[PDB]
Design a protein around this ligand. Structure first.
Ligand SMILES: CCCCCCCCCCCCCCCCCC(=O)OC[C@H](COP(=O)([O-])OCC(O)COP(=O)([O-])OC[C@@H](COC(=O)CCCCCCCCCCCCCCCCC)OC(=O)CCCCCCCCCCCCCCCCC)OC(=O)CCCCCCCCCCCCCCCCC
Ligand SMILES: CCCCCCCCCCCCCC(=O)SCCNC(=O)CCNC(=O)[C@@H](O)C(C)(C)COP(=O)(O)O
Ligand code: SF4
Ligand code: SF4
Ligand SMILES: [Zn+2]
Lengths: 96, 52, 43, 113, 52, 176, 208, 49, 95, 114
């Protein structure tokens, strides 16, 4: 920031870009190193009622894998999923 | 890249190996004013890619 | 609650595209400048 | 219209994709006739090959043929028809419609142990 | 939440070192784009799963 | 949702062909690169004057370990061995017995700092804020065994750095 | 069960079950089990004589096109007499799906190498040789890839100890880094962490 | 001209260390001669700017 | 509260000191045995017993979430004070 | 008890492969002593090769000795091509290791190992 206007103009000319609007050295625009204390929010399970753990038990709703075929009509051929939709080219900047 | 390691150190305490993203979410919340400095980084980083 | 959040209007616009700003003279002009420097030197 | 590039590296642009797909699909069906009728590979591959061949014969355009064959570019549709032909020629040799060669041991796929 | 951010995916044409260089540079551009969208769309709430 | 890097066909009119030939014969992009390097010649460098200037750190920083005390002088560690149960390097070794007033305290509290991965799981596992990981990173030694800390070294680090450790915990305990 | 429970993908579960039926009835010579997990992943459990037909089918079939070998893995399970479980993770880019192909061998039966199906497999099954000892027949260059050159044993077997059997140091007498039997200054402290109470009743194995 | 301001800032950096003796003292100890606001001084003599 | 063996070696708060004939004193030869001189058993003994008027008191070590878990200490024994299991601060029912 | 072979159908083909692998090592040992510039003699390295081959002389399973020939070819390939260094070749010669107590009484004197 302390560069004189001659060096600043020379530097902007040789780069081709305005370098003072976007300086890579940080100054007083950054956040203060001393912050106010937060008050963090709690999750949706911080309730005093209707909050039984068996009604929100993630690990216990996992089941063993359903065995489709085991060794102990004119049905349609299937794929593992539908085919992937063709990507559209970028409207923002296609390089076209 | 040094400034982004400062982002990691502000969010976790380590500059590289944060152990921050964990099974269940992340370890700890963002400290106040971190997103403003991520904004100040991202606002200028395009010029860095441009001169590279 | 006091949490790390963006401001009310959101953040400002962040540039992310290439800016190679097309400086310099034309191809006709640069050869003209070089040939002019040659002719001044020759004279 | 002469597509200039496929975009995929090493995938050459096919000048006549319709005739190439017709030759590949009828050749898949010719090879696939050498498999027994109760083999599910023959039935499923005749099914999808007849569907693709009907789509190829019913659409003179190439772009709409790409949108309704639903398989990317037309040259990689040609490549997948080639791969299916090579697969059918290998499936004749393997004979994988036969019964199971061996049962596993009794607790082989039992997890956790 | 990558189905909620909005970015382009750079695609090469010749399979060489130079197109992969350009793909990495454009991925830095698009990472800046995703970071701008993440800074603007940060929600409030907890940061761990509230299954203790 | 995709873009084509390097799918530009150049213009073949005489203007653009003369542009590219002037770029070849007169080295225009090379002078562009010289100009960008010259632009960084006249910037203020990003160099800090270490050791007289220090790199910026946050109160979360994970440096040298320390065993803390209550504001009475009583040490906080009650020998519960959660920190060596969670220590992913097994750098922590703890023995314990009831001391002479019947209190649950440690006799051994070793941390091999050369096994330690400095991940702060011990300070987040500790239920009484006893083991913390302080701000000291300037503790390089000249011998390997000087980095095999026993309880006396960790209590000296706690007594040494408590004025700073307590303020960093004061700044960061509401996120924890 | 909204905020903390992972939402179940029923569409992909039904689709992968139907495709598992498809693969099981096209290839009944080798397919032993087909199972879809609760988080919608399809496993095909095959006989090891059909490594090349099942993988070549999944690579080349028009309704499969699993052109990408994501990963190739052995898992050592010592209580099974075919203790090594060779896992093939395939990726379809056409249909945007993944399939797991699993087969078995013991220490002496070789598995047929799959570099004719996926050239990605060249280093993977070489790593399986290096780490487990599973020999892959008709491999181009099968040798070690990750362990040291004089290394004895296969480290990812579960009867192999964590620290191995030998350790290195420099010895100034012979001017040479030497291998000596391993001695720890601090032993790796084994923690019996398992709870004596059952965690998941849905996974309870039936008694004898 | 703004070069004169640069030279006057250099000379007042020479002056702000108490002359040439303190200037060379900080030039050879710190390799850095710029002047600052003294925030404090601890019980050892470390001065913080 | 460090004391000293007849060999001159300091004794830690554990009670550890090397013997006169133990060879491992050679690691301190030309160097120092680092002990901490703030013994916690002596420092917590200097804290006065807190007179409270309730039958059950609670302690969390001071500081709220900066101390230890909040435990409840019974004070029915009039012979002996009630001591915190975490911080060692001791309490007496005043009646 | 019907198992898929590796290379050998029975033990005679297996001993043929053991024999060819031994021939290959015996030819290689002078080159290994030369280009690694080992401090051993050619006879000493050949005695070590014979020791390593007589170590596995009890095996009666064709698949196990097929794997022993395969791992011996891998060792040979790492030794002919200079992939091993001098240290890896000299790790067969346990030189810095102290001689272990052999009889009951010296093992009793040093410790608790049987
Ligand atoms: C060109 C020939 C040299 C002329 C001096 C020069 O270019 O000064 C840089 C001067 C300041 O440049 P800047 O990059 O904007 O510096 C901003 C600083 O933050 C502003 O400077 P500062 O805030 O850091 O102020 C302190 C600084 C002040 O800086 C100076 O005094 C500059 C050096 C003068 C010599 O003084 C020092 O650090 C002491 C340096 C002492 C040694 C300097 C080298 C001597 C070489 C010969 C022996 O450049 C100009 O004013 C533009 C060029 C002028 C050319 C004039 C025609 C020739
Ligand atoms: C420098 C040092 C270089 C060290 C080189 C180490 C390479 C070690 C390669 C080891 C390869 C083997 O162990 S294969 C040997 C296993 N063979 C068997 O178990 C079959 C039994 N073999 C025998 O009895 C052999 O003596 C013969 C020669 C096949 C037949 O002998 P019998 O008749 O009497
Ligand atoms: S920081 Fe991590 S590795 Fe180090 S002592 Fe603590 S838990 Fe162990
Ligand atoms: S977790 Fe804390 S109180 Fe428990 S043994 Fe470790 S340092 Fe001591
Ligand atoms: Zn207490």
């Amino acid at each position: 920031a302390s560069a004189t206007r001659l060096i600043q103009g020379l530097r902007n000319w040789a780069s081709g870009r305005d370098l003072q609007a976007k300086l890579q050295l940080r100054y007083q625009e950054i956040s203060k190193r001393t912050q106010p204390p937060p008050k963090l929010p709690v999750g949706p399970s911080h309730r005093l009622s209707n909050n039984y753990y068996c009604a929100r038990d993630g690990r216990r709703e996992a089941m063993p894998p359903s065995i489709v075929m085991s060794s102990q009509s004119e049905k349609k051929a299937v794929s593992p999923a539908p085919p992937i939709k063709r990507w559209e080219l970028s409207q923002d900047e296609p390089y076209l | 890249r040094e400034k982004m390691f400062e982002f990691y150190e502000r969010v976790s305490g380590a500059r590289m190996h944060a152990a921050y993203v964990r099974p269940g979410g992340v370890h700890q919340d963002l400290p106040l004013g971190l997103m403003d400095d991520i904004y100040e980084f991202s606002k200028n980083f395009s010029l860095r890619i441009d001169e590279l | 609650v006091k949490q790390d959040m963006p401001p009310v209007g959101g953040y400002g616009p962040i540039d992310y595209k290439r800016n190679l700003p097309r400086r310099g003279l034309s191809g006709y002009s640069m050869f003209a400048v070089g040939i002019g420097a040659l002719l001044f030197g020759y004279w | 219209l002469l597509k200039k590039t496929t975009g995929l590296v090493g995938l050459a642009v096919c000048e006549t994709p319709h005739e190439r797909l017709k030759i590949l699909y009828t050749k898949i069906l010719d090879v696939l006739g050498h498999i027994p009728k109760n083999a599910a590979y023959r039935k499923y591959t005749e099914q999808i090959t007849n569907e693709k061949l009907s789509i190829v014969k019913a659409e003179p355009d190439v772009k709409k043929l790409e949108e309704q064959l639903q398989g990317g570019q037309i040259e990689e549709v040609i490549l997948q028809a080639e791969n299916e032909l090579s697969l059918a020629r290998k499936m004749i040799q393997w004979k994988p419609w036969e019964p199971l060669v061996e049962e596993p041991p009794a607790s082989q796929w039992k997890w956790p142990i | 939440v990558y189905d909620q951010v909005e970015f382009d995916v750079p695609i090469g044409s010749r399979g060489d070192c130079y197109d992969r260089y350009l793909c990495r540079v454009e991925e830095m551009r698009q990472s800046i784009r995703i970071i701008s969208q993440c800074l603007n769309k940060m929600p409030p709430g907890e940061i761990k799963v509230d299954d203790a | 949702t995709y873009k084509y890097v390097n799918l530009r066909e150049p213009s073949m009119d005489m203007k653009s062909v003369t542009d590219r030939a002037a770029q070849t014969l007169l080295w225009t992009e090379l002078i562009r690169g010289l100009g960008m390097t010259l632009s960084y010649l006249f910037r203020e460098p990003a160099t800090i004057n270490y050791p007289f200037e220090k790199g910026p750190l946050s109160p979360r920083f994970r440096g040298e370990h320390a065993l803390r005390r209550y504001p009475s002088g009583e040490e906080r560690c009650i020998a519960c061995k959660l920190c060596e149960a969670v220590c992913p390097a097994q750098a922590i070794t703890i023995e314990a017995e009831p001391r002479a007033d019947g209190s649950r305290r440690t006799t051994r509290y070793d941390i091999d700092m050369t096994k330690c991965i400095y991940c702060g799981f011990c300070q987040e596992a500790c239920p009484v804020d006893a083991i913390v990981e302080g701000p000291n990173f300037e503790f390089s030694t000249e011998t390997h065994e000087e980095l095999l800390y026993n309880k006396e070294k960790l209590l000296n680090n706690g007594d040494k750095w408590e004025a700073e450790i307590a303020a960093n915990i004061q700044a960061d305990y509401l996120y924890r | 069960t909204r905020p903390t429970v992972r939402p179940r993908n029923d569409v992909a579960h039904k689709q992968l079950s139907a495709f598992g039926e498809y693969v099981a009835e096209i290839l009944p010579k080798y397919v032993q089990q087909v199972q879809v997990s609760c988080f919608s992943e399809l496993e095909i459990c095959i006989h090891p004589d059909g490594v090349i037909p099942v993988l070549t089918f999944l690579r080349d079939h028009s309704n499969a096109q699993f052109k990408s070998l994501a990963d190739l893995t052995a898992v050592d399970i010592p209580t099974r007499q075919n203790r090594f479980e060779i896992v093939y993770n395939l990726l379809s880019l056409r249909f945007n799906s993944r399939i797991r192909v699993k087969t078995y061998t013991d220490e002496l039966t070789p598995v047929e190498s799959s570099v004719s199906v996926y050239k990605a497999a060249n280093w993977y099954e070489r790593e399986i040789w290096d780490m487990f000892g599973v020999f892959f027949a008709n491999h181009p260059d099968l040798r070690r890839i990750l362990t040291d050159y004089g290394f004895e044993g296969h480290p990812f077997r579960k009867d192999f100890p964590l620290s191995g059997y030998v350790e290195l140091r420099y010895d100034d007498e012979v001017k040479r880094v030497v291998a000596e039997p391993v001695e720890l200054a601090q032993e790796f402290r084994k923690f019996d962490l398992n709870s004596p109470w059952e965690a998941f009743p849905a996974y309870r194995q039936p008694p004898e | 001209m703004e070069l004169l301001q640069v030279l006057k800032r250099g000379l007042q950096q020479v002056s702000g260390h108490g002359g040439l003796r303190g200037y060379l003292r900080v030039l050879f100890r710190a390799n850095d001669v710029r002047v600052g606001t003294l925030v404090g001084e601890d019980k050892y003599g470390n001065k913080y700017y | 509260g460090v004391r000293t063996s007849p060999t001159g070696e300091k004794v830690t708060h554990t009670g550890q000191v090397y013997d006169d004939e133990d060879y491992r004193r050679v690691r301190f030869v030309g160097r120092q045995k680092e002990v901490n001189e703030n013994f916690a058993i002596d420092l917590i003994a200097e804290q006065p017993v807190s007179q409270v008027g309730s039958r059950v008191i609670s302690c969390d070590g001071g500081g709220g979430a900066l101390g230890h878990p909040r435990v409840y200490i019974n004070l029915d024994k009039e012979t002996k004070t009630g001591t915190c299991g975490y911080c060692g601060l001791q309490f007496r029912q005043q009646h | 008890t019907s198992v898929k072979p590796i290379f050998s159908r029975d033990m005679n083909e297996a001993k043929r492969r053991v024999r060819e692998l031994y021939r290959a090592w015996y030819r290689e040992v002078p080159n290994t002593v030369h280009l690694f510039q080992l401090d051993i003699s050619v006879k000493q390295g050949r005695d070590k090769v014979r020791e390593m081959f007589k170590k596995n002389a009890h095996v009666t399973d064709p698949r196990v000795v097929d794997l022993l020939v395969i791992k011996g070819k891998m060792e040979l390939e790492e030794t002919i091509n200079v992939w091993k260094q001098r240290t890896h070749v000299m790790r067969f010669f346990h030189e810095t290791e102290a001689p272990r107590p052999k009889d009951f009484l010296s093992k009793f004197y040093v410790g608790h190992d049987p």
